[PDB]
């Protein structure tokens, strides 16, 4: 049966985290 | 006395060279940092065409 | 080495057959010949590899990265 | 480094030659040690050597 | 990782292995390992992979 | 006086030369190593899907 | 990596490229356009002339 | 299938941590 290589899963997780990370005294904390 | 205006200009040029010579490698780092932080493709500069 | 190789290559001309001792001698001579000319290549860096700040590179030059990229072959002959 | 120039009515240098980057170096070498040594007995310091410095 | 094969084991079939990631082949062809007398000593699988 | 007013982030005098620093210089190497790691993972993963 | 721009002339777009030759020290430009034609039904057109 | 080597993952994690670490009485604590 079909398999999922670990590189693809790692890339999925890393890209998902990086999208949220890059795209963002109380007012100054807001983006 | 440097009566002529031409005699006053090469002195200014020499002073410009003397002021530019020491502070040359620091401003390079400053400009590189600004470019690395703001220019969209500036983080890969120096190896843009490589293959 | 050359003599053993030739001798092994021209035995069937006279309808004969080698012997184990001759084979061992030929193998040893061939190994000795190959040892002298052996060269082991080394792997150079890619060309998109960053050079650390400790090398004191300059924005003046392209030393910010390792060389060996062969870029910018643009010109005429379009569709590229 | 040292260079040379060309003269052309329009700047066409397709078939001419170009300056090549020959690099030379100046080599320095070290010499020999300069050594001065003195020697004396312990008793000489005990009874005879004054104002050594 | 890169597979390791013999020259006589893949000769004439390189085009199928070159495009195994763009096309969708049902299988991949390869030959067996044979000695100087023509006898089969190993299967059609690749010998190994790099680390 | 000279009417030029300079502004510095961090300024020091080390060897007859004034040296300045901002907030980006100290993190150039890790960022451009992270980028290379991401690229080298991406192409390698895209090489052999199944 | 060649400087280029787009021009317009009666609803037709033409791409202009500007580049130069290094050693010969000559500059040049070029304009291009790529057309395509179809013929849907030949029974819906032709040539007409005055009849006697 | 494709694999992810341990060195690349270690470098990813280390660089991600170091970027945040290097780039930063109440006022004195702020960067």
């Amino acid at each position: 049966p079909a398999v999922m290589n670990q590189a693809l899963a790692a890339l999925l997780q890393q890209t998902s985290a990086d999208i949220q990370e890059v795209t963002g005294m109380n007012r100054a904390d807001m983006a | 006395m440097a009566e002529t205006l031409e005699k006053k200009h090469e002195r200014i040029m020499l002073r410009f060279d003397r002021a530019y010579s020491p502070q040359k490698e620091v401003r390079e780092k400053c400009i590189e940092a600004t470019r690395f932080a703001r220019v969209p493709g500036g983080q890969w500069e120096g190896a843009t065409a490589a293959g | 080495a050359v003599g053993y190789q030739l001798l092994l290559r021209m035995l069937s001309d006279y309808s004969l057959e080698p012997t184990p001792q001759v084979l061992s001698n030929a193998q040893r001579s061939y190994d000795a010949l190959m040892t002298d000319t052996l060269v082991v290549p080394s792997m150079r860096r890619r060309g998109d590899f960053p050079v650390g700040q400790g090398n004191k590179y300059d924005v003046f030059t392209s030393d910010r990265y390792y060389p060996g990229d062969l870029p910018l072959i643009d010109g005429d002959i379009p569709n590229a | 480094h040292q260079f040379s120039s060309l003269r052309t009515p329009t700047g066409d240098i397709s078939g001419q030659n170009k300056n090549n980057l020959i690099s030379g170096k100046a080599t320095g070498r070290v010499g020999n040690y300069i050594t001065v040594a003195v020697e004396y007995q312990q008793l000489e310091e005990a009874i005879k050597l004054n104002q050594l410095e | 990782q890169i597979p390791i094969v013999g020259m006589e084991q893949i000769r004439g079939l390189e085009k199928h292995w070159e495009a195994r990631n763009k096309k969708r082949p049902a299988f991949l062809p390869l030959r067996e390992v044979r000695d100087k007398s023509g006898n089969i000593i190993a299967g059609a699988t690749p010998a190994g992979y790099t680390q | 006086h000279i009417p030029l007013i300079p502004v510095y982030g961090k300024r020091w005098f080390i060897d007859d030369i004034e040296r300045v620093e901002g907030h980006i210089a100290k993190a150039m190497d890790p960022q451009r190593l992270y980028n290379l790691q991401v690229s080298m993972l991406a192409d390698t993963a895209a090489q052999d899907p199944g | 990596s060649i400087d280029s721009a787009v021009a317009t002339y009666e609803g037709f777009s033409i791409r202009v490229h500007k580049y130069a030759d290094g050693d010969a020290n000559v500059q040049k430009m070029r304009f291009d356009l790529l057309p395509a034609y179809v013929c849907f039904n030949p029974h819906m057109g032709g040539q007409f002339f005055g009849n006697p």
Side-chain angles (χ1 to χ4, degrees), chain D residues 10-14 18, chain G residues 21-26:
Chain D
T10 52
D12 186 74
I13 62 170
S14 295
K18 315 206 171 193
Chain G
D21 185 23
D23 271 5
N25 195 0
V26 180

Side-chain angles (χ1 to χ4, degrees), chain E residues 17-33:
Chain E
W17 287 73
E18 184 192 6
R20 68 201 195 241
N21 65 304
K22 303 181 186 56
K23 293 160 162 37
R24 320 179 84 218
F27 54 90
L28 276 181
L30 215 52
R31 283 162 198 136
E32 292 86 341
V33 183

Side-chain angles (χ1 to χ4, degrees), chain B residues 5-48:
Chain B
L5 272 299
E6 291 86 6
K7 180 67 174 66
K8 294 186 177 71
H9 189 262
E10 92 284 337
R11 293 201 294 107
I12 293 167
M13 299 286 111
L14 287 184
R15 278 180 169 181
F16 190 94
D17 291 331
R18 291 202 297 113
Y20 175 77
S21 173
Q23 284 287 120
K24 151 85 157 57
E25 297 84 348
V26 173
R27 314 275 192 108
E28 265 171 30
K29 291 299 288 194
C30 305
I31 297 164
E32 175 196 358
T34 55
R35 195 158 260 278
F36 187 89
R38 303 304 198 192
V39 168
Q43 302 210 324
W44 278 96
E45 282 180 7
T48 308

Side-chain angles (χ1 to χ4, degrees), chain G residues 1 3 5-7 10 12 14 17 20-21 25-27 29-31 38 40 42-44 47 50:
Chain G
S1 71
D3 213 348
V6 177
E10 293 83 3
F12 272 119
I14 297 169
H17 280 289
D21 185 23
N25 195 0
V26 180
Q27 275 158 173
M29 318 189 186
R30 54 175 290 155
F31 308 79
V38 300
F40 298 127
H43 297 160
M44 321 185 88
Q47 320 158 5

Side-chain angles (χ1 to χ4, degrees), chain F:
Chain F
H1 309 302
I2 308 288
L4 302 187
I5 316 295
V7 191
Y8 302 97
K10 288 164 288 188
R11 177 206 177 264
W12 313 282
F13 201 100
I14 300 294
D15 271 347
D16 311 313
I17 288 301
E18 159 193 55
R19 310 177 185 269
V20 302
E21 191 203 285
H23 207 78
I24 297 282
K26 279 202 287 191
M28 275 195 247
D29 277 336
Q31 165 82 80
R32 77 159 79 242
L33 214 53
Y34 180 82
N35 287 342
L36 175 69
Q37 292 320 301
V38 165
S39 299
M40 282 211 288
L41 183 64
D43 57 352
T44 294
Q47 201 158 4
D48 294 332

Side-chain angles (χ1 to χ4, degrees), chain A residues 16-27:
Chain A
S16 190
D18 286 333
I19 288 175
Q20 188 274 331
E21 189 172 350
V22 173
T23 67
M25 65 182 179
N26 296 115
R27 312 225 281 151

